[PDB]
Design a protein around this nucleic acid. Structure first.
Ligand SMILES: Nc1nc2c(ncn2[C@@H]2O[C@H](COP(=O)(O)OP(=O)(O)NP(=O)(O)O)[C@@H](O)[C@H]2O)c(=O)[nH]1
Ligand SMILES: [Mg+2]
Ligand SMILES: [Mg+2]
Ligand SMILES: [Mg+2]
Ligand SMILES: [Mg+2]
Ligand SMILES: [Mg+2]
Ligand SMILES: [Mg+2]
Ligand SMILES: [Mg+2]
Ligand SMILES: [Mg+2]
Ligand SMILES: [Mg+2]
Ligand SMILES: [Mg+2]
Ligand SMILES: [Mg+2]
Ligand SMILES: [Mg+2]
Ligand SMILES: [Mg+2]
Ligand SMILES: [Mg+2]
Ligand SMILES: [Mg+2]
Ligand SMILES: [Mg+2]
Ligand SMILES: [Mg+2]
Ligand SMILES: [Mg+2]
Ligand SMILES: [Mg+2]
Ligand SMILES: [Mg+2]
Ligand SMILES: [Mg+2]
Ligand SMILES: [Mg+2]
Ligand SMILES: [Mg+2]
Ligand SMILES: [Zn+2]
Lengths: 230, 65, 144, 66, 117
RNA sequence: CUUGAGUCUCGUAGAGGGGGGUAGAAUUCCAGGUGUAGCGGUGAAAUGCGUAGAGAUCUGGAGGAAUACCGGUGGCGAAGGCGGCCCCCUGGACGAAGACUGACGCUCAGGUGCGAAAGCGUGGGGAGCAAACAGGAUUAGAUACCCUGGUAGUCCACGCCGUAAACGAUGUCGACUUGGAGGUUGUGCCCUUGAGGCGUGGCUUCCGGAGCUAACGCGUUAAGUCGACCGCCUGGGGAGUACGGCCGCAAGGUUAAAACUCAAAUGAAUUGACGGGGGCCCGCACAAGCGGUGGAGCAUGUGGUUUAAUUCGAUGCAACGCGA
């Protein structure tokens, strides 16, 4: 465990360090298995040009089209935080995501902590950023509630989760359970897989389907260990 | 085998092209001593002669050239 | 057989032509041990085949299976560590069985209301290298 | 390498003698041992190991009976 | 178009592709085929049967030249060396002379590094 | 004085060293000839190159680097190292016989020199290869492995650096101590000699006796038996680090602590266990076959859900028509 007695997680992603429709999906599956309410934030929109913003929003809407709260905030310019502040009030929110995405900087901006005390902030070099914050610290929200700064992560793999729990984790799949002619429908190429055609007509996000399949096949690679996770 | 010593030869001559050509393959490669049965010092003399002949184009370096 | 490559047992000749191949044919065609049904079917089919082919019905069966017997077939091998197809020749005793097997399945697919007729029609087309029994033989030769 | 056909010679025997000639020169092993550079240290160690293995095999040849 | 009536079949048996060309004994090319241009790609491209196909794929487009006999010079370690000429004879070509011309250096140049596969 | 050491005469073998020519393959490039549509690369791909004509093939040219086969468990060198052929200069070793000198010897702190690769300075050269870097794939990422390119460097001249698992992890010199099989290079005698047999030296490889060793192993080329001299060690980290000195253009090298901390750290061998290490040998394990299950209806068991209660137990194989 990283943090307990949590009420809400906020998946913090940023375009510069890495854009990963795969890590976001792994986090969504996890929090769905943990019943914790998630929320997606995308940091450093200041780096993207206006065309690039219109190029990132039409796939950030993938999740807001299945209800997920999706916000875009620039920590350096403090742009568009204000709805994030509102969504953060009066709850317990763990700031999670890859290293370098801006989780510490976002906290500095939101908390408005005294200048003498600030979270460590090093800039990313080449492909990926450093791991500055190596701890998990609680912070009292100014208005109400608490946030938690967490250390950056590389792989949020899910071999502990059962394969069915991944189908449940994708919320856009309940609309098609029991609609597959083969009852034990792996849904990849099995005939009559409802979600197959569903994504054929664009009802489902293709990227989400491919991510589901690839994380399933990833579980096969990491099932090599005989250690137990129960 | 060991014909050189058997004839007590003192020095193998590069100019001869009929004798030492029994010691190269059709591709012109120096046949190893394991199968010719020649002895070490004579094998070395043979290699030097053969390289000399190659230099003066009495023996081809390779079947292609 | 990992340790002992056991030899195959002998089949008894058929009580109507003393032909080992005919008995093997009825053994292949048999279903649920109902030998009598199979022998009825095979004798009916052979006799109608005789009517179309005139004399020597047992011989007509021989040349029918001959026109579709396989010579070369693909075989799998894992020596490479990956699935590997290889074209290999077939022993006569085995290609006999392969021809008989292909004939009977093709007949079952033919339908048209009677097994007697299906078998006879397939045999009649086989006798002249046709009926798709030869086509299945031709495709596995092409796969060499 | 070079194999010249004669008059009234079957093509198959010509092919087989050509291939057995080219493999008598070991040309394939030559072009395969010159595909990647091999540091002289690894060359020396593998040569020495092959040699000592040869010596051990020729020793086993004559230590069993005696 | 013009019958030389005598010529040479040059093969190129790489571990990736097989290139079979036809030319006069003087080295001016007439027709050339390749397992790649034969509709075989990837692992399918570097197969002995692919080279066997490319054999006819080359022989056809030089029927107008109609060389009767020919000499083959094969160079390359790739599979299919023997199968090209086996197929070429099955096309009615008569092989006057087979010869290997695999380029071999006398320790002339540094080859690339060993792949740490 | 001549037995140690050294000189001379006559020969032998040798990738010993330095300098200069030259050769033949091969890579790349350029120009041209033929000619078509792909080439290239991988596990599979992509990047990349190709219609201005690639790739392929032929001819001519240019340049650099290295010397298939011989080739070896081979040779030479103090060590590092040394591999086409030829010439010039030059070092060492060994053998036979004889003469010569007459202890002139061994080791060596300081000192001097040589010293792989990488690296540094200046100036050339640059074909191939290739840190860095650019790109394409894989991947969470690939900052790596793989792919396409590619700079320094790799080469030459002159300086500098002075370190390597610079290893036989075995200092140099001398004497003595059972054997066997080899390799290489001298040399004597006898043979009818090619052969062949008796000997006698040098170097070198593999077994193995006594003996030694913790064991592994060493074993006349000792890690045996002994002499002479030198270097080095005193638990593991801290640390070959700090400081100072010396050296270096610099990178850094050499000499070289202490505070502090632990009760271990380590070498060999034993038994087992494990290996994305091998050799197997079996098994309807697979293959070869025949019929099924998986879809339908129902029977039955179980999970779940439900219920006042749906009694309890059995739960990977080896629970689920199981207790019953
Ligand atoms: N351009 C830009 N940089 C930003 C922005 N927000 C934060 N950054 C910078 O991006 C870096 C993020 O580092 P940090 O916040 O520690 O990352 P993290 O996502 O919290 N994880 P970790 O601690 O593991 O690195 C810092 O240099 C920060 O100043 C932004 O909106 N724009
Ligand atoms: Mg942070
Ligand atoms: Mg493991
Ligand atoms: Mg390559
Ligand atoms: Mg005197
Ligand atoms: Mg000293
Ligand atoms: Mg250097
Ligand atoms: Mg330099
Ligand atoms: Mg320079
Ligand atoms: Mg590279
Ligand atoms: Mg990438
Ligand atoms: Mg010089
Ligand atoms: Mg040292
Ligand atoms: Mg040492
Ligand atoms: Mg000692
Ligand atoms: Mg000394
Ligand atoms: Mg021993
Ligand atoms: Mg100490
Ligand atoms: Mg130091
Ligand atoms: Mg089976
Ligand atoms: Mg069913
Ligand atoms: Mg129960
Ligand atoms: Mg109980
Ligand atoms: Mg039962
Ligand atoms: Zn489905």
């Amino acid at each position: 465990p990283i943090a307990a007695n949590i009420d809400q997680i906020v998946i913090v992603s940023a375009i510069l360090p890495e854009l990963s429709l795969n890590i976001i999906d792994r986090y969504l599956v996890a929090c769905e298995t943990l019943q914790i309410e998630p929320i997606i934030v995308l940091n450093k929109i200041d780096l993207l040009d206006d065309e690039g913003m219109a190029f990132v929003n039409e796939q950030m809407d993938i999740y807001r089209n299945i209800g997920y709260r999706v916000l875009m905030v620039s920590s350096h310019t403090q742009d568009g935080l204000k709805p994030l502040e509102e969504a953060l009030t009066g709850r317990i929110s763990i700031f999670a995501g890859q290293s370098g995405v801006g989780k510490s900087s976002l906290l500095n901006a939101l908390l408005g902590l005294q200048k003498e005390i600030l979270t460590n902030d090093i800039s990313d070099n080449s492909g990926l950023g450093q791991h500055t914050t190596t701890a998990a610290r609680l912070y009292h929200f100014p208005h109400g509630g608490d946030v938690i700064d967490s250390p950056g992560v590389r792989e949020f793999g899910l071999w502990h989760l059962e394969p069915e729990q991944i189908t449940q984790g994708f919320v856009e799949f309940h609309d098609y359970l029991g609609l597959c002619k083969y009852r034990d429908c792996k849904h990849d190429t099995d005939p009559g897989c409802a979600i197959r055609e569903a994504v054929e007509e664009g009802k489902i996000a293709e990227t989400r389907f491919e991510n589901y399949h690839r994380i399933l096949e990833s579980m096969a690679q990491v099932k090599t260990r005989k250690n137990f996770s129960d | 085998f060991c014909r050189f010593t058997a004839e007590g030869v003192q020095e193998i001559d590069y100019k001869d092209i009929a004798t030492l050509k029994n010691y190269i393959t059709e591709s012109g490669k120096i046949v190893p001593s394991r199968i010719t049965g020649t002895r070490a010092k004579y094998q070395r003399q043979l290699a030097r002669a053969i390289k000399r002949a190659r230099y003066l184009s009495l023996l081809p370096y390779t079947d292609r050239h | 057989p990992r340790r002992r490559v056991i030899g195959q047992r002998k089949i008894l000749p058929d009580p109507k032509f003393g032909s080992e191949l005919l008995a093997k044919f009825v053994n292949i065609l048999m279903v649920d041990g109902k030998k009598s049904t199979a022998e009825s079917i095979v004798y009916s089919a052979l006799e109608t085949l005789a009517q179309r082919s005139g004399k020597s019905e047992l011989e007509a069966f021989e040349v029918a299976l001959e026109n579709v017997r396989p010579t070369v077939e693909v075989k799998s091998r894992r020596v490479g560590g990956s699935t590997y197809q290889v074209p290999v020749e077939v022993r006569p005793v085995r290609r006999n069985a392969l021809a008989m097997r292909w004939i009977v399945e093709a007949a079952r697919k033919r339908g048209d209301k009677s097994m007697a007729l299906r078998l006879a029609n397939e045999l009649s087309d086989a006798a002249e290298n046709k009926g798709t029994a030869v086509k299945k033989r031709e495709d596995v030769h092409r796969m060499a | 390498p070079v194999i010249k056909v004669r008059e009234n010679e079957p093509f198959d025997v010509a092919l087989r003698r050509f291939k057995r000639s080219c493999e008598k020169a070991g040309v394939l092993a030559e072009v395969r041992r010159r595909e990647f550079y091999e540091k002289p240290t690894t060359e020396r160690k593998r040569a020495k190991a092959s040699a000592v293995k040869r010596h051990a095999k020729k020793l086993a040849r004559e230590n069993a009976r005696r | 178009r013009k019958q030389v009536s005598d010529g040479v079949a040059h093969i190129h048996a790489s571990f990736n592709n097989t290139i079979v060309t036809i030319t006069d004994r003087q080295g001016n090319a007439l027709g050339w085929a390749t397992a790649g241009g034969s509709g075989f790609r990837g692992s399918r491209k570097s197969t002995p049967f692919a080279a066997q196909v490319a054999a006819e794929r080359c022989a056809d487009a030089v029927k107008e030249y109609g060389i009767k006999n020919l000499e083959v010079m094969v160079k390359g370690p790739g599979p299919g060396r023997e199968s090209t000429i086996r197929a070429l004879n099955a096309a009615g070509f008569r092989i006057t002379n087979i010869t290997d011309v695999t380029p071999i250096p006398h320790n002339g140049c540094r080859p690339p590094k060993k792949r740490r596969v």
